[PDB]
Design a protein around this nucleic acid. Sequence first.
RNA 1: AAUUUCUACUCUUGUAGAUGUGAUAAGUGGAAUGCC
DNA 2: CAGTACGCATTCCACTTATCACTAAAAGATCGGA
DNA 3: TCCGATCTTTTAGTGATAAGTGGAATGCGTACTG
Length: 1302
Amino acid sequence: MTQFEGFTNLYQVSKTLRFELIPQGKTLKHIQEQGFIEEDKARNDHYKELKPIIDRIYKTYADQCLQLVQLDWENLSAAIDSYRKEKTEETRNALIEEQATYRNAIHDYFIGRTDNLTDAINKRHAEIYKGLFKAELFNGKVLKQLGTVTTTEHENALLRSFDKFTTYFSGFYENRKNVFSAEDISTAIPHRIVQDNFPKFKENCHIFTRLITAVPSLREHFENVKKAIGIFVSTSIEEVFSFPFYNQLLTQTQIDLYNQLLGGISREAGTEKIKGLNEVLNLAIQKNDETAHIIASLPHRFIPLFKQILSDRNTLSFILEEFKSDEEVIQSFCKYKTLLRNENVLETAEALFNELNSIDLTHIFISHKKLETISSALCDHWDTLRNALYERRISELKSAKEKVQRSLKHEDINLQEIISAAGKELSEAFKQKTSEILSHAHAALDQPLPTTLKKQEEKEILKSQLDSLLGLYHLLDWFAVDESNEVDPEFSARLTGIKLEMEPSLSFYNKARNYATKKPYSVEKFKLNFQMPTLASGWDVNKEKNNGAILFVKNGLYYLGIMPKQKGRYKALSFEPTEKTSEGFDKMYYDYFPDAAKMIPKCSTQLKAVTAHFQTHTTPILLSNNFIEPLEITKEIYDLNNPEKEPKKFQTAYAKKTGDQKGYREALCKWIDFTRDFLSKYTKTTSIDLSSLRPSSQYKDLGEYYAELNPLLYHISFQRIAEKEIMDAVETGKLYLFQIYNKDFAKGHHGKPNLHTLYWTGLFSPENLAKTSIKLNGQAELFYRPKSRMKRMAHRLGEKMLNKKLKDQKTPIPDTLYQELYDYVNHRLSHDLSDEARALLPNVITKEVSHEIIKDRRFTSDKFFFHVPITLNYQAANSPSKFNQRVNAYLKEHPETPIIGIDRGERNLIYITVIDSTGKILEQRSLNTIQQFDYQKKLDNREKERVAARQAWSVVGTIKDLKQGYLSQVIHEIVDLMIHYQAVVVLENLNFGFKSKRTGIAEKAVYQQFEKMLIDKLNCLVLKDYPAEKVGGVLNPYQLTDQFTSFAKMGTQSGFLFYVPAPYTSKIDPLTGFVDPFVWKTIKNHESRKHFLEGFDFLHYDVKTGDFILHFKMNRNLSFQRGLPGFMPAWDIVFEKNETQFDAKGTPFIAGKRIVPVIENHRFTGRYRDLYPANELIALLEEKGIVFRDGSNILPKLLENDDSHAIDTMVALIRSVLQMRNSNAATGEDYINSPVRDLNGVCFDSRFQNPEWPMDADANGAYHIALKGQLLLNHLKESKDLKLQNGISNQDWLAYIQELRN
RNA sequence: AAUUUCUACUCUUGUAGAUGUGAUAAGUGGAAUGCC
DNA sequence: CAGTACGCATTCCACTTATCACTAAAAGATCGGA
DNA sequence: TCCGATCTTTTAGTGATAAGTGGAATGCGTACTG
């Protein structure tokens, strides 16, 4: 019993706004005179340079701590494989209990608490650990206390440059405190050694011992490869793969050497490489004997261990030298090409090429390890010469025939044999290839060195000469080097000499690649402080003196006030509040007590005076300072807050562990009375009303009281300050005044503002001031982005200037036409305009230039910036309580809820389908365009441009610009329909590796980041045209999805967003629910093809309408079926005639026209093909003599012809009909056609173009996920648990859709 | 083609939508190169 | 003539997940001056 | 030798929180070997 608008004020969210600061008057001049920006720039560079040093200290303490680790690992392995075998809830509780046990066990080594270690060094560890997270990292207290890392005088001076400024590193201190924490944190060291590395090592032990008891001879090879690599020499190989050896491999170097033994070591380029541990398994697979088969029947991957958290890698492989300037690499190439030009390489290279003609090619052999690129370069395909040689040595001779292919991949072959095998044309192809390679080499020698690298053409020409040099280097490597065969010794010696003269060119190409691909020089923003250690960290009236940040409101314009530390002192600059009738600024008066749970013992119970008084005697203590009346602290509350143990007496964890409900209730009541007493007596909160809080005994949970009490301590008021004081303060430099500014506050602001402007206005609304639904937070930052230097081009006066759109706003203009039309309208045509330029010229609109628009204006000049965090929906708790249960209760009470569906892909990025509760579709359309220009046509061009420029050593760029520029308006469209229909959105749930890989091939990362933007909008949702007081406004925003924290915590349902299982969601008939149960992997041979033939029931041609009736039952072809059938016991396949009808609008189309790509070879090559199955079968039956006009059974006439051609052709036709996808990227004709006639009496073709059915394949997929949402809703309807089912089964979904369609 | 910032624009010295910042750590995917 | 899967390593680029802060007051260093 | 103002540097800590199975989910690259 609830409403849709009731899903608000359930949990609070926090957001950060951004603004530009503009100085007013002489504040900029005083900032320039004080030199705060250069000091802050040098300070930022010193912090960036100095961060590695504190990092070194932390690394050193880390590995010095974990060198003495001594503990068992059996119990965690027992918990892990018990959870693997059982997957039961109590096993999971035992697993997480032991995981926390081991995490705190290693954490005791950092603390110094563990009983196995001696007391002196763990006391030292305790002192050092107390020393890490305080300011003694700068005076060298813990540095010399450790006393193991050297620090030169430059390092000491850099460390001394941050005197009285160690609070700058407070974020660094927290970012290391979470590294050394032990609360399951993903960047914590115990979490890494317990969760991220130990299960991998445990399963590694398991696969090693299973492989060893499978093949006992492989331990010999493992020990020899360990001895050849010479690591872990004190240990035997099965002792490495055992649990007690995980007492090592916790520091960085041991994990790196283990991973090195996994992956092997390489020298520099052109030499050998010692095989790793998995390389010998891959070679055993390559051996292809029965041991290979018994190895492959087991698994054979040893997963390398993850790198430790704060450490740095150290490899034994060769690390190439990296250039650090353009001058060094360009001069080293200058001397390298000088060596080229004075050694006279071209004469001897040409002579070496002419020895191919002077001497017979039987004395010239080839390198068989890389003959494949030779076949690619000379012939059209890489396999042609290898096949031709194989058949050629067959012809001069089945085991004897296969001896030719057995022998050909381990010996060098003369070029004359290749010429005899594949023809004479390879001789002239070889000589023209040498001619063109020497042509590129001569062009490289003719092309002079450049002067710089900034222009792209210089990188292009250096790249081109580098490809010439490397191509010559490989051309030397076609021929074999050794003289074991019958090559000419002079030929081999000459090629060897000329190839070790060209050996450093490959390494040169590698280093030029390493330097030229790096990012260009750019300048970004940095934090500003004005020599203030705690600038803008809080706006409170007590703390604004040393924080130094206050705001003003001046007739709708918001200002920032930064009063600096004048002359090294905090001048008490105060303003008297004048009356509101007097003109001037409105200074904000923040009044905040941060957290009730946090500082109610920090100001009353955990002071040093009270704890010093309390450890001697039990007499209560009276506290007078910062208390209007004295407050009494007794022993019966001090023992509660300090119970010398993890569970406090008033905490719910004590009642969970013990169960003493009465004692827990009494302790909670006493603590609650004490808290109320503190808020009564304390000087900050004595003037705050507490009458709205419930009595003591009513409460059931302490955190509930803290969540209720926290909003009461926050308050804003406002007072009026005369502007004479502000103007005089800015004039004398006592106050720096910056205006909070975006272009919504500009002069010509007409329409709707930005959204952040709307929260910024709604923060300071009087309705929000009376009751704070959203709240302003602290730690504001000031940034200074300097003057980024670009050349300026802009539309000047007296010019005519072109609009991007046409007269009709629907049709844009392509950029290639746009630049030519722009050159025309400015009368600067560098080329003659084309024919479509004539066609589209009189249909375009132009404008005269006005207001001097400049491109990249915001980056033209140096600008201040200001980032401010705010907290929304503040009256609710910090975390929701059974959000999904409330959503499912609402859906149980509202069975008439519509469902919308979103899909993701490449051809169609998104698609919209809206259904009702009964499956009738409301609305469906495309948003590949948003009625603006179709973003796909530019987005794929941007993708291919990045792909082309990444290999061309150009700038790389980003894809997120066009990505989120599509996705913002897309997100707007889905939220608009979502609120308009009050519907439930569904998105498909996919495996993480799937989305990662598909981001790998295609640069469309929307399978995860669409979900991210949809979640981070659907949790805090405001609408610009909604009134503020109504739900959906800025003070009561729409909370529809659960508060996401991580994908591990994220589940099958997050409020109104439903994830459905991925399989069988796209290629299903909506008319009756048809899919093909077979796979084509099982049918490989011919008797299996005959079995697939006989799996059908009967095959009959109805001569009345021309369709061919084929029928199947699932109790046949069980092996070919994947074990997942449809529910309907019968499936007639209407093999219809290719008869041509018209669509809804009347365009002609052929029914049953099933387009398939014609592959030229097996390797999925070739173009598309307009192929019609029914004419093919009637041609096949006429060719085979099979009578079809009889109308009787025809499958006996198919199976009486036992030739493989007939059964192969009808199985191919069955595959070409049973498919569901009919796409054509060349012409844009993609559609879906169903083979099974419905009970209405029609076969579904997507060219029906009727509104009640999907228009496309992705339309059909969105329709299916809408009905999986409907199926989950039905499962909710007959469930009383108010929870879900853990996904849904694929066969259960298919049974559901077969029941409901037919 | 003007933006806290991005995206698409120009009836409009601006328009429509979106926008949690900072720091730190780990992991992943591509390009080139050798190597097995 | 296709069928069935494919190991590693160094440089660069981009990206993606996960964690912390959402602070005023207590505590301590300190500096002039007495 | 000592004191109080002043500036910089820690600190304090609540309840809430898994849960589970299957192979497509969407476009398709070489290369040794089936």
